[PDB]
Amino acid sequence: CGRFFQKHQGTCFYFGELPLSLAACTKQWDVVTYLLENPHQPASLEATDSLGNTVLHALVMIADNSPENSALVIHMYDSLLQMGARLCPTVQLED
Amino acid sequence: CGRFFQKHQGTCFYFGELPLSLAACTKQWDVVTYLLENPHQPASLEATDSLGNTVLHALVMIADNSPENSALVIHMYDSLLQMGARLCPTVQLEDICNHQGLTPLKLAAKEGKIEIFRHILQREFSGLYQPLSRKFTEWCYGPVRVSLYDLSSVDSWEKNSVLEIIAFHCKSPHRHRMVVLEPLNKLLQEKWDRLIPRFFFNFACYLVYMIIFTIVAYHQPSTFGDSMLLLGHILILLGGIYLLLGQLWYFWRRRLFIWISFMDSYFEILFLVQALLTVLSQVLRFVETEWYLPLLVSSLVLGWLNLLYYTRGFQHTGIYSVMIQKVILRDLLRFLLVYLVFLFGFAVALVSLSREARPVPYGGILDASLELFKFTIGMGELAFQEQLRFRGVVLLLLLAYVLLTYVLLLNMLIALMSETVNSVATDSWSIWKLQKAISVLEMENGYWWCRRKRHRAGRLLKVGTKGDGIPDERWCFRVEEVNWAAWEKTL
Amino acid sequence: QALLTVLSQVLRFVETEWYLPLLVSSLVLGWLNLLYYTRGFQHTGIYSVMIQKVILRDLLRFLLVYLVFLFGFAVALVSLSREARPVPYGGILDASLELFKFTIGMGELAFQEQLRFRGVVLLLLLAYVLLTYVLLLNMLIALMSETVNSVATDSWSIWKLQKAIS
Ligand SMILES: CC(C)CCC[C@@H](C)[C@H]1CC[C@H]2[C@@H]3CC=C4C[C@@H](O)CC[C@]4(C)[C@H]3CC[C@]12C
Numbered sequence A: 001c002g003r004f005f006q007k008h009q010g011t012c013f014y015f016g017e018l019p020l021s022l023a024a025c026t027k028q029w030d031v032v033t034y035l036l037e038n039p040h041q042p043a044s045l046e047a048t049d050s051l052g053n054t055v056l057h058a059l060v061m062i063a064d065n066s067p068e069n070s071a072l073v074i075h076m077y078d079s080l081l082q083m084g085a086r087l088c089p090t091v092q093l094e095d
Numbered sequence B: 001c002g003r004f005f006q007k008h009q010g011t012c013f014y015f016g017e018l019p020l021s022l023a024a025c026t027k028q029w030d031v032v033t034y035l036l037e038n039p040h041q042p043a044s045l046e047a048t049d050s051l052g053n054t055v056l057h058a059l060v061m062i063a064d065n066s067p068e069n070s071a072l073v074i075h076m077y078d079s080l081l082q083m084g085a086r087l088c089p090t091v092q093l094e095d096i097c098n099h100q101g102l103t104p105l106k107l108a109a110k111e112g113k114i115e116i117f118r119h120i121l122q123r124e125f126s127g128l129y130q131p132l133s134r135k136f137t138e139w140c141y142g143p144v145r146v147s148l149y150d151l152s153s154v155d156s157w158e159k160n161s162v163l164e165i166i167a168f169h170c171k172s173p174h175r176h177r178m179v180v181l182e183p184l185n186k187l188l189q190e191k192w193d194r195l196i197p198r199f200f201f202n203f204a205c206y207l208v209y210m211i212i213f214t215i216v217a218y219h220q221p222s223t224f225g226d227s228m229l230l231l232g233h234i235l236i237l238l239g240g241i242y243l244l245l246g247q248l249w250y251f252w253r254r255r256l257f258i259w260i261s262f263m264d265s266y267f268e269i270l271f272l273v274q275a276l277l278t279v280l281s282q283v284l285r286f287v288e289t290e291w292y293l294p295l296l297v298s299s300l301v302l303g304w305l306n307l308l309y310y311t312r313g314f315q316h317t318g319i320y321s322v323m324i325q326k327v328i329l330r331d332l333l334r335f336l337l338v339y340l341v342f343l344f345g346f347a348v349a350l351v352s353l354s355r356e357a358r359p360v361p362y363g364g365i366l367d368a369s370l371e372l373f374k375f376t377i378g379m380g381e382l383a384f385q386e387q388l389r390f391r392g393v394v395l396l397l398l399l400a401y402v403l404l405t406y407v408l409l410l411n412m413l414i415a416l417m418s419e420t421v422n423s424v425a426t427d428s429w430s431i432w433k434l435q436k437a438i439s440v441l442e443m444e445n446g447y448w449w450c451r452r453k454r455h456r457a458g459r460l461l462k463v464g465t466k467g468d469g470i471p472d473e474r475w476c477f478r479v480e481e482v483n484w485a486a487w488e489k490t491l
Numbered sequence C: 001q002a003l004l005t006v007l008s009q010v011l012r013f014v015e016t017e018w019y020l021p022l023l024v025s026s027l028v029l030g031w032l033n034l035l036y037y038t039r040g041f042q043h044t045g046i047y048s049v050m051i052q053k054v055i056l057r058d059l060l061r062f063l064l065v066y067l068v069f070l071f072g073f074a075v076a077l078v079s080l081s082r083e084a085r086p087v088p089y090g091g092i093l094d095a096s097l098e099l100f101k102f103t104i105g106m107g108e109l110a111f112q113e114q115l116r117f118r119g120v121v122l123l124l125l126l127a128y129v130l131l132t133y134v135l136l137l138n139m140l141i142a143l144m145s146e147t148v149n150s151v152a153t154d155s156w157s158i159w160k161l162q163k164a165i166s
């Protein structure tokens, strides 16, 4: 929760201020997985930041109306939804 | 140094009149090298010709705005710069002064070559040639990147900068496209945002001056009121002399500009004329003449018309003003020529007849001309006058004039205005940006009585290390961009 | 419109001298607002959207330039033409109205001879005519043409959004 990582005008980049959301927002589909089957301390997927935003909220924040960013956001959204299907079936992330 | 190898009009080809420059200009990247490692007599790379032009100047002169020549010039420029890095590291080729006092960047700016100018303005290298770069890329945290553009010889703080060259020296047909590109864009926007208060303060001062002018002109004859009127008269005199002095200082310190570009400013002339008329009328009231009020009201009209100078400053209205200028210059003068020819012919014809009785209409040339011009404003009389012996000839002539001038010519003028507006809808924005750049460059200076304190643009950063000593630090301009395309191509 | 109507109705009990102006202003505003229901049909709703776009895009700046020109020329004509060799161009409002008559194709352009500066008046009037009626209004027509050609595709979506709001 630093001035650079919040949503404002100027020097900023909001990614959800969470390591899982940070990895998801950077098209790093190798470490996002590893945060989910690390046997020692698993990373919760329904975890929210100080702004009340979860990983999907962070993804939809960073979405621009560009052909190259929209594809990234869509693919990460779909893949992470399928990933969360196998981890937390009793709770739905869309709500 | 022969007539064929100099820069003139006709049969000529200027290549720098030097064997090294000749080889470089012909895409001969086999012999240009050989001139540099021949053991017997090496060829100096900082060698200049009789025109004060080095090899880099020769390269930039032969540059045309063509996709096939621009690539050649750019590649030779970059390759020769890298080659000279390994031969002469203690000297910098980019800062070789011409006989006219120009550098390759400044020479590109003045000659209007836009492709090589843009490439030189932002060029980046990968490895050993970091110092030979203008645009640097600092920390790429995620998809946001900060670009530092070199502000050497392009920031207006220097005496002869690139911004001033484009504004006041470039004679190119389209020099408004060189003012909107990268690190020539953002810098001007920042300067305008910082100079807005001064611009609107000048606007307010001029508005107050014309309010005083209108009050004085409206309340003059053919006490407290008399004292206020005298104060207004003297205030107008000093205001007019101030405007005249400012315009004279402008034309003194910018004497050439009237020949490089008449069409681009065209308000300094109007301000000068208005100030001249005002001061002349004020010094003409002491003569107690009869031609005072005409010139006074002419200056009153001209100033209120010139008030549209400050219409610039807003995109919506500035682009409208630019389009107004384009419409006036493009499809109004020839219409006026044809209209005056038709009007004069028909007016003379109507005056020639209609004096043979079977006051009098169409008595003279001016009367008939006015009666015919009334048709344009939808007020022409088209009666069947019966006092004349040739009523039918008059009616037929009037009908011919009406169908030939009011139905055809004015509607065709409307169509021409429509197509002109559709044609110049994209360059007007660049023209407005160039006008803003000129206004900013003028406002950076002070006045003819007080020179403003100059302000550095750009921050000092940490660029890198030179190959001679240690730190080689330069003033840079920082710009952030949220770009995902570049971030895709770095995984 | 509702505020004007209720205020005028509560102003009739006071027997106020300014009842009829507000009453007729509300009468105009209601009939103008009747074009709210013009939307509801595609052909007329898109026309209303285009009318709004034209008003917002290329009518206000024309009005600014026109008022600047009109004020300058009206003040100029009022300043002179009071030197005899009623009286035309007696005041600012009279001269402004006479100059605005040119726009609606009703301006008088005679060579008045009672004035000492008839030539200056005629030249000024001609300059105003060529600078405002030949150039500016035709350029307005051209600007509306290009604006209509520019917004011919988004107006349908704007009308759909208006229907969604309704
Ligand atoms: C120069 C002296 C003799 C006056 C005659 C020229 C004046 C009256 C005419 C000639 C060309 C005209 C100008 C042409 C271009 C522009 C720019 C536009 O954005 C506003 C109108 C404006 C400013 C016109 C105002 C009237 C104008 C200045």
Ligand SMILES: CC(C)CCC[C@@H](C)[C@H]1CC[C@H]2[C@@H]3CC=C4C[C@@H](O)CC[C@]4(C)[C@H]3CC[C@]12C
Binding pocket: C029, C032, C033, C035, C047, C048, C049, C051, C052, C055
């Ligand atoms: C607001 C009070 C003071 C009245 C002044 C504003 C009125 C008279 C003017 C200003 C803007 C104008 C409106 C601009 C837009 C539209 C939408 C169009 O589809 C029909 C005409 C209509 C409805 C115009 C009617 C007249 C109008 C409403």
